[PDB]
Write a protein that binds this DNA or RNA. Structure first.
Lengths: 5, 102, 79, 22, 98, 90, 95, 79, 90, 102
DNA sequence: ATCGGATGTATATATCTGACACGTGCCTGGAGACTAGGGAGTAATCCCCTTGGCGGTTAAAACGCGGGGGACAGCGCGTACGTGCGTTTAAGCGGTGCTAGAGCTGTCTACGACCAATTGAGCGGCCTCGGCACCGGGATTCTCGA
DNA sequence: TCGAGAATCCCGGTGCCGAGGCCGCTCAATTGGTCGTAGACAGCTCTAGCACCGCTTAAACGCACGTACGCGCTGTCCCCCGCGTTTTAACCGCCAAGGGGATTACTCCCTAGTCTCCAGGCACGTGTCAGATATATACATCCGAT
């Protein structure tokens, strides 16, 4: 659920 | 079992002996191998999940080294961790400099 | 003589993967230098591990132990 | 009554310069 | 009958996309033999052991070419010269090529 | 004598449909080892600083915060904390 | 009545010869205090602990300036610009 | 405000020891950046060691352990 | 609890006339420690590779050849070999 | 004594204890602490000698950090060994680039 | 290229401070002496796999000839950084004072090492198959000379 | 902006072997005890880090000035790219030897573990001389003038 696309 | 009581896939029992025979301390705690097993499994899951979704868009159902490379080198937090290590036959991310284009 | 085993287009395409456009002529010889230098340092440490194990045959793990002992950690051949 | 010596050089560079062999 | 630099771009993206070894297996095979001969004579290499050398070697070289190219562009030129490679190693320090 | 069978179990949880090649399996196996010793050494070195002869969950947790960058360290700690608390009862 | 750049060289050799800290003691002390506030509140620093920060920081910067200057000269110029600082760090790698 | 505690001639002489001749204007601001970044990384690990030791006072040894844990090993303050 | 008194003895050997400041003494003391753990860890990691539970003179020697760069490793081995052979008969 | 029987200055007895309690292995050899003591003493001698020679040129009879810095950074093998380490208040070797001179 | 004027810098000397060096008393860590376990040296084994030969296929390395284009030297415009001097800001020194908290010590409780008997998770070996490499052929996309 | 030409993407068929699921078979993990001590814990000692007052002045700030350096642009050219042809030899599949990794079976001997004993090495005083400090001065460098 972190930074992603 | 212990790993089943830990709700983890990674063997807490095997990890526990490794902190003993690995010569890290005289007395290794009881919760220590459980905690470490939860961190290892998480990171393993974190890579596999990012690799697999990156593998399915490539229309392949088997994860190959290129997929792992694409997963790690495209995540800020992950890439920094595995900065010094190079994945065998993983290739490199397609990057072309700006001033090299017409 | 054997250091010339690797070729000009071999080096040329290695630089393509590196993302370069134009490559000079003196590059190919300069590249052979750093390659022989890199290999020497790795093999020196690799053979050192092999000799300590009282063996005349270098193994994959020996190369891994050598590579990992100088910031060049390698995945795929044991751990 | 003192101490011994070895073969010393200098920073000697690299990236273009020589490396030592024997 | 294209243009000077067009094919250059074509080979870049086709190799970055691939993971195949860019140097021949057998010439590199005997290359490791010679270098190891200086440290110890009559040595044997596992089939995977040589591959380990070849993977790390190519990986290092590709990484070196990237830093080299960055130095080249910084000098307002698009062609890489030994002048760039040498500086790239110096800035990297000791651990970074010695 | 590796983690081969465990990484496959974790894979099927996050992705029951996809599989993994043997070469990539070795890579992931080298990964969890390189993660293991990296944390283990740091935890051992941490206890040595405090003249403690025991590695505990507290050492492992602090080791995580030192190694893992930032956004990863937080979740890693939580995943670790939850596990220990599971082993307090059952 | 000297020349633009002559005194510059004189200051180079005068600082390379010395081992004195090039940054002020007191501003750096409270600077470390501020940075530490984000991680933990109400912290105290040993007299040697702050000095340790100043030694490593200054040493790193000087080392960074050296690599920077080489990038500057490589662009056939003698003046260092932010373009050089950024590139110097990229080539150095992580940590 | 306090990051401006370090001054322009302070950075200017740091570059003299580095052996540079002419210095641009934007350098001084860029240098403040890498300095605050460097301090952040070191102190973060330093405080982390301090917190693990159940102490409200950071010590010299804590900074040494932090610096040495990222290739910036320092002699003179313990080992 | 340091090597302060020993480095001074070695100092008088190489230079009985000159002395050493406390700051430089601390540097040299941090030096021999950084040399100790670096070799000890490498030697420990070396025996672990060969599944041996004993660190011996053979492991330490191999560690020297791995850590110490050329010409320094050779003399270091000789100095080590000379020491061991003296304590072998006496 | 043992270090005196070894003909060394560095304490073989103390070093032997550190290799034991330091958790590097279960069984520490008998010759191992002697071998390591001879290597540490040698390197210490190698550095101190070059430092003293660098001290005599500064007209000083007391070795300061500056002397140590000058010693290490002028020897290939030593500088390569202590590459990652930085000497506190040791300064840097006086070096001015070619194209910066009149 | 030569010269004196002007600025900074290395040099000789003298005084003055404080930190290094040596001293002693004390204690606890290392040397002696002894026993016993078991890791390791040692010999003999099995057989894995590394090395080396012949020989055909052909992908790829080597060679050469244009010629577009980028490396390179020159050079003209001009902003901007260096140099210097005067005004201004706080670092530095030291002095005094409180108290948070590093450091230490003596409790005794909880915890991991330890051993042994047990057994199921996990490694090694074995087919089985369908994902993927291989391929050929047509749809699509990017490049390039008037 | 126009179309011709060459590459890459893509759609579907066929064939290959590696990955995935089974199966004995250990042997390492688990259970359930007990023993000993590392460490959680509370009280105490006091180092030292913090904070304000106030004098000195080294150092930072701001400003005016001139030059040489950054940078843009035009010129030259030679060298590296692109292409077609010839040449090399990597690649692959096969067969064959035996060096030596991996293995195992015994048994020696080297090291951990202890108690006692005492001296090596720590803390901590005590005095002095190397060196930080200052100043007057000879010597080394830059710079404008010619």
């Amino acid at each position: 659920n972190r930074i992603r696309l | 079992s212990r790993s089943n009581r830990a709700g983890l896939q990674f063997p807490v029992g095997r990890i526990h002996r490794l902190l003993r025979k690995g010569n890290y301390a005289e007395r290794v705690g009881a919760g220590a191998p459980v905690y470490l097993a939860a961190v290892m499994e998480y990171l393993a899951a974190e890579v596999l999940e990012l690799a697999g979704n990156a593998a399915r868009d490539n229309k392949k159902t088997r994860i190959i080294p290129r997929h792992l490379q694409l997963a790690i080198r495209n995540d800020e937090e992950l890439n920094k961790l595995l900065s010094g290590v190079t994945i065998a036959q993983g290739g490199v991310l397609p990057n072309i400099q700006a001033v090299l284009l017409p | 003589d054997n250091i010339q085993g690797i070729t000009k287009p071999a080096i040329r395409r290695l630089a393509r993967r590196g993302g370069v456009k134009r490559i000079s002529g003196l590059i190919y010889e300069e590249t052979r230098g750093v390659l022989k230098v890199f290999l020497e340092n790795v093999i020196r440490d690799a053979v050192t591990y092999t000799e300590h194990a009282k063996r005349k045959t270098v193994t994959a793990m020996d190369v891994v132990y050598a590579l990992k002992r100088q910031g060049r950690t390698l995945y795929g051949f044991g751990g | 009554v003192r101490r011994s010596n070895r073969i010393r050089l200098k920073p000697l560079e690299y990236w273009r310069g020589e490396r030592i062999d024997y | 009958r294209y243009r000077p630099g067009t094919v250059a771009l074509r080979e870049i993206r086709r190799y970055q996309k691939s993971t195949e070894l860019l140097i021949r297996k057998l010439p590199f095979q005997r290359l490791v033999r010679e270098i190891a001969q200086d440290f110890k004579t009559d040595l044997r290499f596992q089939s995977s052991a040589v591959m380990a050398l070849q993977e790390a070697s190519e990986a290092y070289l590709v990484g070196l070419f990237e830093d080299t190219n960055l130095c080249a562009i910084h000098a307002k030129r698009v062609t890489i010269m030994p002048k760039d490679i040498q500086l790239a190693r110096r800035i990297r320090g000791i651990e970074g090529g010695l | 004598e590796s983690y081969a069978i465990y990484i496959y179990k974790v894979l099927k949880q996050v992705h029951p449909d996809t599989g993994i090649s043997s070469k990539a399996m070795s890579i992931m196996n080298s990964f969890v080892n390189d993660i293991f010793e990296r944390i283990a050494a740091e935890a051992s070195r941490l206890a040595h600083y405090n003249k403690r002869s025991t590695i505990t969950s507290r050492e492992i947790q602090t080791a995580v915060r030192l190694l893992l960058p930032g956004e990863l360290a937080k979740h890693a700690v939580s995943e670790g904390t939850k596990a220990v608390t599971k082993y307090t009862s059952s």
